[PDB]
Design a protein around this ligand. Sequence first.
Ligand SMILES: Nc1nc2c(ncn2[C@@H]2O[C@H](COP(=O)(O)OP(=O)(O)OP(=O)(O)O)[C@@H](O)[C@H]2O)c(=O)[nH]1
Ligand SMILES: CC(C)CCNC/C=C/[S@](=O)c1cc(C(F)(F)F)cc(C(F)(F)F)c1
Ligand SMILES: [Cl-]
Ligand SMILES: [Cl-]
Ligand SMILES: [Cl-]
Ligand SMILES: [Cl-]
Ligand SMILES: [Cl-]
Ligand SMILES: [Cl-]
Ligand SMILES: [Cl-]
Ligand SMILES: [Cl-]
Ligand SMILES: [Cl-]
Ligand SMILES: [Mg+2]
Lengths: 121, 995, 208
Amino acid sequence: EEDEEVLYKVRAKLFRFDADAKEWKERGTGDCKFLKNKKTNKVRILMRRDKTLKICANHIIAPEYTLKPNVGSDRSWVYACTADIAEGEAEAFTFAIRFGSKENADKFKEEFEKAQEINKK
Amino acid sequence: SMEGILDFSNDLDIALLDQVVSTFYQGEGVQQKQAQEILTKFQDNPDAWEKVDQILQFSTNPQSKFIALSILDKLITRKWKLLPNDHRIGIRNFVVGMIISMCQDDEVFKTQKNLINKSDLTLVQILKQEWPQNWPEFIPELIGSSSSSVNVCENNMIVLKLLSEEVFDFSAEQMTQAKALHLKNSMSKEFEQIFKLCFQVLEQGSSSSLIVATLESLLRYLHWIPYRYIYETNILELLSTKFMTSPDTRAITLKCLTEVSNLKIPQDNDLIKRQTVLFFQNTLQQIATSVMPVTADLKATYANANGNDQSFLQDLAMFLTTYLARNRALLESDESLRELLLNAHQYLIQLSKIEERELFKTTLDYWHNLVADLFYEPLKKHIYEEICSQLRLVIIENMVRPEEIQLYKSEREVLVYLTHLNVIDTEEIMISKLARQIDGSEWSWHNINTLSWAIGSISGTMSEDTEKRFVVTVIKDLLGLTEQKRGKDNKAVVARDIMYVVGEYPRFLKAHWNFLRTVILKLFEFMHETHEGVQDMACDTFIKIVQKCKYHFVIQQPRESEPFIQTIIRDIQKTTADLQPQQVHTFYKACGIIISEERSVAERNRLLSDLMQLPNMAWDTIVEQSTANPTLLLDSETVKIIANIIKTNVAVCTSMGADFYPQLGHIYYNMLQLYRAVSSMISTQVAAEGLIATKTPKVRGLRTIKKEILKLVETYISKARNLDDVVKVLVEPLLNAVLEDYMNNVPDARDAEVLNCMTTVVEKVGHMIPQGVILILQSVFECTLDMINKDFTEYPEHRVEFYKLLKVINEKSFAAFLELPPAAFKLFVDAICWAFKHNNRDVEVNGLQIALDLVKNIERMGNVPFANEFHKNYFFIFVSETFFVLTDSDHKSGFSKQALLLMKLISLVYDNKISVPLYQEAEVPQGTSNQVYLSQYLANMLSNAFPHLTSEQIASFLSALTKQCKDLVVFKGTLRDFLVQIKEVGGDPTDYLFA
Amino acid sequence: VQFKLVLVGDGGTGKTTFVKRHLTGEFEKKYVATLGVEVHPLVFHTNRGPIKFNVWDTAGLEKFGGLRDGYYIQAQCAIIMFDVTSRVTYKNVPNWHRDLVRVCENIPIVLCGNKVDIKDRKVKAKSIVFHRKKNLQYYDISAKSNYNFEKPFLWLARKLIGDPNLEFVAMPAAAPPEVVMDPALAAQYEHDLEVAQTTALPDEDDDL
Ligand SMILES: Nc1nc2c(ncn2[C@@H]2O[C@H](COP(=O)(O)OP(=O)(O)OP(=O)(O)O)[C@@H](O)[C@H]2O)c(=O)[nH]1
Ligand SMILES: CC(C)CCNC/C=C/[S@](=O)c1cc(C(F)(F)F)cc(C(F)(F)F)c1
Ligand SMILES: [Cl-]
Ligand SMILES: [Cl-]
Ligand SMILES: [Cl-]
Ligand SMILES: [Cl-]
Ligand SMILES: [Cl-]
Ligand SMILES: [Cl-]
Ligand SMILES: [Cl-]
Ligand SMILES: [Cl-]
Ligand SMILES: [Cl-]
Ligand SMILES: [Mg+2]
C-alpha cells in the first residue's frame, strides 16, 4: 500500500454470498480503502479487518461492475467481483458492502464510479 | 483400510490402530478427520475395553495406549461392579504392573510422562471403586515401593496428588455424599503414614523432580489436613527457607505457603503466632537474598517475560496479599517486625506497577482491604503513610474510565479512602500530574483522560471549602491547557475532560449558579460542534448535570427572570437544531427530569406542554394530512419523522413517568389510529411483496412506529399512579388496537413487543380487568404457542415474552386460566412443560415458576371439582416431566427450581392434601392411599427409565425423597446422589441414608 | 512455525463461532454442536514473521465429547471458554482446567469469558478469579462484537515465540489482477445476482 494514494476511506462491513447455504456470510469489518497505484493509476478496493488487519477485499474496481441495492437495506451495495485475491488465488464472489448510513453508501457509490472512470483510461 | 479396527468379528490389528492414531495426531485435513471418526467409534464400542490389555502389551504408539486407558476409564467409572472379582483384580494388577515397568525404565519415565500420568489417573479411578474395602494394603505397599526406586517414589507422589484431588477437590459433583465421606475418612485414617513418607523425602531427598512432585502433592494435602502436620513438624522451616532458595521448588513452595496461610489455626496461641510470623520472615528474606531486593523494578522484569518470572511474580502477589489480609495485625505492634511489614507492602507497591490488568486487580483487592482498615481501625494509618503515598500515585496513574464498572468502582473506593487519609498528598499529586500535562512532559490523550477520571473519582471526599479551591484550580489549569493546545483534535480531548470533571462535582455546581449556567450554555454551544464525539459528550454531560442538579433548573435563581427550565424550553429548537435524533431524545429526556421536579400540577403540565410543542405540532401537521390522504405514510421520510416523534415521547415519558399522563392523553387517540393505519400497510405490503417485505427499510420503519407506540404505553403504565385512568381511558382502546392485529398477522409480522406491553398491563392493572386478561389470552396464547412449539430456536423474543406474560397472568388473574376450555387448559400445561425442556435460562426458569405458582393456585381452591380434576389430569404429568429434566443431564441450570417443584408435588401426597385417588379404579385396591400409589408409580417409572438400577436402589432413593420432602437442601442432596448413581452400575442403596 | 492450540469449555459457550470468525470473518448465529473435535490451521502475520496455530476446537457437550482429553496430547497452548450469560459454564471452568493440565502440565492458557456483548451479564467481573492461582491470562471477549477478539491469540503468540513485543501486522497487499468478463457466464451472473439482491443482509439494526 506504500506505492498507492488513498482516494477514499470509509468504515464498512463486507459480506460474500454463499449459494450453497443460500445466505450472506460476513467476510470482514473495518476500513474500506480505494487505493490508486502511483505506477499504473489503477484504483483497487483494499479492505482490512479490525484488530487482526487481515485482508477481506482486494480487487480492481472494474469499469464493468454495477452496484445494485439489497432488498433489506438503504445503506448497502451488492456487486459481482470476478477476481478478488483477499484469501490468495483469484476467486469470483457476489459481494455486499454495508455502511454506517445511507449518506456513506451514496458517497461510496459516487467514489466507486469516479474510480471506474479512472480505471477506463 | 483404517475402518478395519471397527470390525469386532475379527481380532484387532494393532499395527492398523497405530496407523489410525498416527494419521489423527500427525496427519492433515481429509485423512486426519476420517481417522478421528474411526477412533471415536472404536473407543465408544462397549466391548472395546476387552481389547485394552492387548493394546497396552503390543502397541508401539503411546497415543494408542492413552486412548486404551480412556476406554478402560469408561469401564471403571460406569460398569466396573458387573465384573467378577478375579477380573477386577486382573485389571488392577495389569495397570499397577504397567506403571511400575514404565517407572523402572529411565528412558520411558523421561519421554512418556503423558502415558504415565494417564496410567496414574486410571489407577486412581480403580482406587475410587476398590479402596480401601477391597484393597486395604494399597497405601502400605505404595509407601514400601517408594524406597525401591526414585522414579517409583516420584510417580507414587503423582498418584497421591491425583487421589487427594479426586477425593477432596472434585468429589462434590462426581460421587454420592456417602461415598465421598467414605473416601475422605479412608485418606484421613492413613494420612499419618503418607505424611511420614512426604516429610522424609523433603528432609533427605536430592532429586529435584522427586522433591517438586512431593511438594505438588503437599499443595493438595493443604486443602484438608489438620494444621498440626505443618506447625508441629519442621515442614514450615523447610518450605520457608530451603525450598524458597532453589528455583526448581520455589514456584510450588510459594503456592504451598499461600495455602499454609489459609489453614484453620488456633487464635489465642503465642507460639503459633510466632511460627506464622517466622515463616513469613524466612520467605521474604529468601526472596530479597535469592530473587530480587525490595527496590527491584518488577514492572521491567515482568514486561521482559524471561522464563517463569511472570508466574513467579503472580504467585508472590497471591502469597503476600493472602498472608497480609489475614496476618498483618501480627506484624503491626512489635517494633522489631516493622521493617518486615513495610518491606512486604513495598514488594506489593512494586507488583502494583506491573502492566498486567488481572495481576493489578489482585493487588487492588488487597489495597482495598488495607485502606478500608486504615479508615476505621484506630492507631493504624501512621504505620503505612509512605506505602499510602506511593499507592496514591499508582492508583491515579492506573485510573480507568467509569465504563469499566467493576475496576473503576474498586479504584475509586481505594482512592477515596486514600484521599480521606491524606487530602493534602492526594491534591499535590493530582495538581503536579496536571502540571506535567501543561509542560508537555507527560502530555497525551490517554494521560489527560486518566488524570481527569482520577480527579472526578474523589468528588465528595474533600471539605466543601477545600473542594471549591481544588475544582477552581483544576478548571483554570484545564482551560489554560485547551488555549495552549493547537488543532481541533487536541482542544476537543481537553474540552471533554473539563465537561467530565464538572459533571462529577455537582456539590460545587449547586453552590455556584453563575458557573452552572455558564457550563450549560457552553454545552449548548458544543451541541452545534460537528467534530466527532463533542455533541455526544455535550448531551451526556447535560443529562448527567441535570440528574444531579435538577432542582437548580426548576426554581427561580436570584437575579434570573424565570426558572432556567423555561429558558431551555424557549430556545430548544435552536439548541437542538444540529443534533442527531438519539441526541435530541437525550436532550428532551433531560428536560423531563427537570420538569418532574415541579410539584405544582398547573405549572408542571404547562412546562410539559411547552417541552412537547415541536413534536406535538409536527404530529398535528402529519395527522391533518395523513387523515386527509392516507397515501402520505408511503413517504419513507414521513415514517422516520413519526418514529422520531414517538421516540421523543418515550424519552420524556421515561424521565416523567406518572407525570407524563397529560401528554399521553393529548396524542393517545390519534396514536392508536396511526398504529391501525401502519398495521394495514404492513399486512398489505407482506401480501404484495412476500415475507421478504419484513426485511425492507419501509416495513422495518413502519414496525418501528408500532414498537415505539407499544414502548411508550408500556413505559407510562409501568410508572402510572392513577390506575383508574389506565383502566377507564387507556386499556380498552389499546387492546382493541393491538390484540386482533397481533392474532391476525402471519407469524413473521407479529411484534414480540405486544406480549411485553401486555405483561406490564396485566402486572399493573390485571386485578382490575378480568375480561381484558381473558381477551389478551384469547388473542396471543394459541397463535404464539404454535410459533414456538416446533423447536427451541425460532422466534426467540416471542418465546421469552410469551412465558413472562403467562407467568404474570398466572400470578395476577389465575381466573383467566379457569375460564379456558379444557382443550386450551391442556395446551397451557403442555406450554409449561415445553418451557421446562428449554436450555435458554430465561424460558426454563419462568416455566418452572409458572408450574410452582399453578400448583399453589390449585392448592388455594381447596376441595372443589376443578382442583380434583386438575390433580387427576396433570399431577403425574408434572411429576414425570420434572423428573425427566432433572435426570436427562441436558437441564442442569434448572436443578434448584426442578427440585423445589418436585418437593412441592411429593409433599402434597405425603400430607394427604389431594382429596381424590390419583389412580384409576381397579388399578389398585380401592382403599389405597395416594402415598402408596405415588411410591409404586415412581418405582415403575424410574425402573423403566433406568433399567440398570436395582429395585433396592430405587426403593431406598424414593424412601429418602419421601422423608426429606420438607427439607430442600437434604432433598437436593438425595437428588444429586441419584444423578451420580444413574451414571454407573451397582450404586450402594445405603447411600440414601446419608445424614 | 506451528503450535497445537486446544479449545475447551461447555457446549454453546462460542468456541466454534470464535474460531470460525477468525478463519473466515463470518459470524455463525446457529448453534451446531461440535462432534468430538474440528481441526483448522489459523495463521497470524507478526513483526517476527507468520505464526500458525493448529486449532483443535473440541466438543463441550458430554454426549459429543469423543476422545475428550485424548485431544489435549502434545498441545502447546489452550483457550478455556465460558459464557458470561451462563453461570454453570463458569462453575465448570475448574473441571475443564483440571482435565487439560493433567495432560498439558506446562502450557500457556487463556481463560475467555465470551458473549460480553449481551446486556444481561450473569458472571460478574468480581466473580471471575479462578485464573489468578492457575496463572491463566483472562479476557472478556465477544465473538459477535469482536471485543478483545485477537487478544487470546496475541497473548499466546507472545508466550510461544518468547517475545513480549510481538505485534500482529498488516499482511502487505499484492496488486489484484485485471479481469475481462466471460460472455458465456453473463447469463449465469444475472441469476446469482438476482438471488443475492433479494436475500436480506443479516443484522440490519447493527452499527455496520
Ligand atoms: N451474543 C453472542 N452470541 C454468541 C457469541 N459467540 C457465540 N455466540 C452464539 O452462541 C452459540 C454458541 O455457538 P458455538 O460456537 O457452536 O458453541 P460451542 O462452544 O462451539 O459449543 P460445542 O461445539 O457444543 O462445544 C451460537 O448460536 C453462536 O452464534 C458472542 O460473543 N455473543
Ligand atoms: C470543542 C473544541 C474543538 C474547541 C473548544 N474550544 C473552546 C472550549 C473550551 S472549554 O470547553 C471551555 C471554555 C470556556 C470559556 F468559555 F470560558 F472559554 C468555559 C468552559 C466551561 F464552561 F466549562 F467553564 C469550558
Ligand atoms: Cl460483472
Ligand atoms: Cl489482619
Ligand atoms: Cl496523543
Ligand atoms: Cl439541590
Ligand atoms: Cl401557568
Ligand atoms: Cl445438578
Ligand atoms: Cl450406565
Ligand atoms: Cl488461516
Ligand atoms: Cl493473573
Ligand atoms: Mg463447537
